Amino acid sequence: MSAPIRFGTEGFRGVIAREFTFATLHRLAEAYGRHLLERGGGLVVVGHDTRFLADAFARALSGHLAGMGLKVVLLKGPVPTPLLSFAVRHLKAAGGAMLTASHNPPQYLGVKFKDATGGPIAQEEAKAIEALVPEEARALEGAYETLDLREAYFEALKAHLDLKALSGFSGVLYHDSMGGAGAGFLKGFLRHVGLEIPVRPIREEPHPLFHGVNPEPIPKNLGVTLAVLGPETPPSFAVATDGDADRVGVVLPGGVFFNPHQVLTTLALYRFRKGHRGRAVKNFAVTWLLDRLGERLGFGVTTTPVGFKWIKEEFLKGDCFIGGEESGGVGYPEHLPERDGILTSLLLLESVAATGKDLAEQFKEVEALTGLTHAYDRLDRPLAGLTPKGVDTLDGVKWLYEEAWVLFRASVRIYVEAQSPELVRALLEEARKLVEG
Template sequence: MPIKFGTDGWRDIIAEDFTYANVRLVAQAHAQALRQQGGQTGGKSVVVGFDTRFQGANFARVVADTMAEGGLDVWLAAEYLPTPALSFAVVHHGAAGGVMVTASHNPPAYSGYKLKGSYGGSATPSIVAEVETALDAPETYSGPRGTVRPLDIRQAYYEQLDRQLDLNILRAYRGRVIHDAMGGAACGWLTGYAEHAGLKLDLTELHGRPDPLFHGVSPEPIPQNLSELITLLAQESGQTLGVITDGDADRVGAVTAGGQFFNSHQIFAVLTAHLYRVRGLRGRVVKTVSGSRVIDLLCQKLGLEVLETPVGFKYITDAFLEGQNDEGKAVLIGGEESGGLSSRGHIPERDGLLNSLLMIEAMAASGKSLTKLFADIEKEVDFQHHYNRADLHLSSQFDKAALLAGVQNMTDVAGRAVEGVNTRDGVKLTLAGGASAMFRASGTEPVVRVYVEAQSEADLRAILDEATRRVYGYDPGQQPG
């Protein structure tokens, strides 16, 4: 099976296609691409890390040894670490790039190879293309071997978080926080930061023991994987908060007192308002096409420019990099539907730890729960946010192109007239009443994701059900179950 790079690197099933041999091939190609950066001088060093997945440390060692054989000096993580810490290490050490051995939120059977650019963020399409070219046309390297030295970035990364947060606000906060690390790479990191910064939080960890099986779930911060945390929070009230980080800690989720899941759109909106109003920061707001209408309406109120991108944090990274070179295009905050966000002054990388702390900071500064903060935004923009997503697994006979062509011709969904069609990534239909339905087909699997936003739970359910039926109508090999 050929090695295929997706929107954030290469992922495959451990021992089936994610093997030492294939990892070595990818690392050789990556080293070749890094050596060729910057003309004759080329890249000199690379940072390699891993999460808590099965054989993660050993796969990382294969990467490090292969890249050293390819002439690069390697900083190799001494223990598992979060992806944002790895990305920060790339910048901190002035490396040409980075590798994170992780499959992020994928099920435990998977591992992966995430590429990081010298700027400390997701690899741009051009970087990925260079590695793919080297895979197809490998060159023999006969120069001197590079070194492998241990990486310990925790203290420097914590100091970077210090610069992104208002520690006076955080140190005055006394609320209760439960961090569900899901057995992933953030285990011990949030509690470690609280101790480093002298925070007096009532902070406890759930699933804080590193576990290659992620304590029985896929390490993605979505409601179906959070039953234990939701049950714990159901008995709480006030400002008690549950924060969740995914397998490699670049994504974030939240559960509020009463056991209510607080989705990524709501987090995005609350942090945008907090950074603008409390922290006094300015800049563009970057959202993927699957993002909520609430973000657009809020930015209209605040007078902030919104830049909409296709799905994938690499597009948000591009906007951050553009803003680093042009103050007029500086980014205040950028985020995606899956829970990845970054903000001004930080690396152009999703950071579940930073965003967990920013949520706590927003609560501490306002004296309000996240639920109340978002309710205030809903009232301000006159929009009631209800959202859900369905991942529809279809047969090999499924015709994605026919579906997307058909969606563009829809005149209504569940009785709501289509008022606009956006084809930036998949097809997003704007519906009467402020609702929307987006259809996006996977590029590698027979899967269609349907994203729906509406102003009532009844409308949400009706639109999602109708959209699901229409998708299955284009699949002759499978009927809805």
């Protein structure tokens, strides 16, 4: 029969013109509209990133939903996922749909749904929408408004930043947009609040092929940025936002990569010292330095399986101050129960200005306070000369060691954290031979 449209951890994803076609988009639109009408209808906000035809798919989805009876607002131009999520809450909409494949290769596109709280829909809602996908659908049209909420988004951001402290930043901020939707948002925000902090753009021009790399802010896709920062000096640094800017990667002077674990713990420490209380939420693949920081300084740490839905559920409890993943996505409860790479970039900037220490130095302080050294890598039974100290199968299989951890996840992906990059590499080499044949 017709091609079954199965979702994959929130939303649908596929290769453009293969599984992700206008025909499939309209079937998904029908499912989503029926789902919303069953709950009272309302306003729906639609957005898209810079991927090829994302704009056309978004217009098609908007028209279809409008033709079904939903009030629709399509955000003007490519927008970061967090702006779409913000718009949903700001406009008091029943939900939102974002055309994006985030950090995935150029050929992919997908639809990611947000609920009224301005964050990813829960699994239960995802299943409900999936169940309503019809075998066949029509390219229904309808009238809708197209709005620009950039200014309002900037005003919302302002409310969660220490502008006085920010003005003290003495360096330059490089912003590698990777040809993605985060382009111009950092300069925009600063200009919006009259902060004369210089922002030097890198790959700012929107590009469906993201200038020849995957819009995932990791070393293999950051060659150009690692080069630009090579001869730079502290406290200047670069933030690289992914395709839809819900994630960020950092590059320091000398062309040194500052990973998600370093970003998350550095920001957790900074926010904690500013007085924020409650617990930090992290998925299963996040550094154990966060757990240690929490035990050392006095804040709880909740560990969840991989999937931001788990972090959002906890945020809505109202007793959290930060939530993060090993992929660069970080959420701030008092802002939105969503990953926001733009706010993450601005908080990193704030931390450097307020503390007077560049990111590398702030992380060194994290290592001092935790008493642990950090090294990490990912590749997709005792190992090396390490004596195991237990196993944890919350999500996948994690072998515990003294000062080292090895996680196997059959999504096979091997995540390793150890005291040195050399041990990390050795562990991966020995762990690998365990999945060979």
